[PDB]
Design an enzyme around this catalytic site. Structure first.
Site, mmCIF file in Angstrom:
data_model
loop_
_atom_site.group_PDB
_atom_site.id
_atom_site.type_symbol
_atom_site.label_atom_id
_atom_site.label_comp_id
_atom_site.label_asym_id
_atom_site.label_seq_id
_atom_site.Cartn_x
_atom_site.Cartn_y
_atom_site.Cartn_z
ATOM 1 N N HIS A 159 36.134 34.285 34.858
ATOM 2 C CA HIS A 159 34.859 33.953 34.229
ATOM 3 C C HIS A 159 34.264 32.683 34.870
ATOM 4 O O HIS A 159 34.969 31.675 35.015
ATOM 5 C CB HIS A 159 35.101 33.743 32.720
ATOM 6 C CG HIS A 159 33.886 33.308 31.961
ATOM 7 N ND1 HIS A 159 33.740 32.033 31.467
ATOM 8 C CD2 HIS A 159 32.757 33.976 31.630
ATOM 9 C CE1 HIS A 159 32.571 31.929 30.862
ATOM 10 N NE2 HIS A 159 31.954 33.095 30.948
ATOM 11 N N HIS A 163 25.649 26.775 36.419
ATOM 12 C CA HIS A 163 26.185 27.004 35.085
ATOM 13 C C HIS A 163 25.055 26.440 34.245
ATOM 14 O O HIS A 163 25.013 25.244 33.973
ATOM 15 C CB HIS A 163 27.467 26.220 34.822
ATOM 16 C CG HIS A 163 28.007 26.422 33.439
ATOM 17 N ND1 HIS A 163 29.216 27.036 33.193
ATOM 18 C CD2 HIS A 163 27.483 26.126 32.225
ATOM 19 C CE1 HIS A 163 29.411 27.111 31.888
ATOM 20 N NE2 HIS A 163 28.373 26.567 31.279
#
Length: 296
Positions: A32, A82
């Site tokens: 992930h 992110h």
């Protein structure tokens, strides 16, 4: 391609699996937000970091699916983000790591999920999709075949899992619905179906039940080669304290590792985890790979 002991070789574990097996049926470890391993800034890492090692370490530990989140820059390149955080990693950097690994271990294949994480920079010339396809996808390591991709056609290549809209180049798994924070089911193509458990930002109790519930469904539906099962074991919440992805993962990984171990299933699906390492007890990725003994 005969001994079950061959699945114990993390760098070449896909070697024993028959060439005719669709990637869907294979139980594959994944990572992930794969490119967060450079975040070393104390406050950035308590909210954004989900991995502590690089791409090669990850692949050498059997990971074959990578969660890539990019952003279109001024320089007309795609970099890893992110949210609004530039990860100090680029898409080229990932593709190059993938190539070296596949050069050393031609028996393997790597599935790359590509998602637009942040809005394009103002001075960009093209869109995210066209930029990615004209400058990157056009590279030969990218498998351009579609449908229910077999392991044989994928060896030595990078299989793309599209999580971006507006594609014009055939190849890999097509983009589908994918609603926010939940488990759902949809179709990839005419000859495929998908079940994804993506409940990030949820309680630990609800999370664990979700993982196990989805994992039971794939266990009992082991012989359905036309069904894709993606199970995210990652959990994100309010950082700053022991609510970080590292804290949840320190419990979730061994927990699910054991769950798989006890049940001894023939299929667990694609399991995308946080913090792939050698700290936690039973090792999730290793148990996931082992569940493929039924394919040998």
């Amino acid at each position: 391609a005969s001994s079950v002991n061959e699945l114990e070789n993390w760098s070449k574990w896909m070697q024993p699996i028959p060439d005719s097996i669709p990637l869907a049926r294979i139980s594959i470890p994944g990572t992930h937000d794969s490119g967060t391993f450079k975040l070393q800034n104390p406050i950035k890492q308590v909210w954004g970091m989900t991995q502590e090692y690089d791409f090669r370490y990850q692949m050498d530990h059997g990971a074959r699916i990578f969660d890539i989140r990019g952003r279109l820059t001024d320089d007309n390149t795609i970099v890893l983000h992110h949210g609004p955080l530039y990860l100090y990693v680029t898409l080229h950097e990932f593709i190059n790591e993938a190539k070296q690994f596949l050069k050393d271990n031609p028996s393997e294949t790597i599935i790359m999920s590509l998602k637009k994480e942040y809005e394009d920079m103002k001075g960009a010339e093209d869109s995210f999709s066209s930029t990615f396809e004209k400058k990157y996808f056009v590279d030969p390591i990218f498998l351009k075949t579609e449908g229910n991709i077999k392991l044989g056609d994928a060896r030595g290549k990078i299989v793309l899992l599209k999580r971006y809209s507006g594609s014009n180049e055939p190849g890999g798994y097509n983009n589908f619905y994918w609603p926010d924070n939940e488990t759902f089911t949809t179709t990839v193509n005419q000859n495929a179906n998908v079940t994804v458990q993506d409940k990030y930002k949820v309680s630990y109790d609800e999370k664990v039940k979700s993982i196990k519930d989805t994992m039971d469904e794939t266990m009992n539906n082991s012989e359905d080669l036309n069904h894709l099962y993606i199970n995210f074991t990652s959990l994100s919440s309010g950082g700053t304290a022991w609510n970080s992805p590292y804290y949840y993962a320190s419990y979730i990984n061994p927990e699910i590792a054991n769950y798989i171990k006890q049940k001894n299933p023939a299929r667990v699906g694609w399991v995308i985890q946080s913090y792939i390492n050698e700290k936690w007890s039973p090792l999730l990725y290793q148990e996931v790979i082992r569940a493929n003994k039924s394919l040998i």
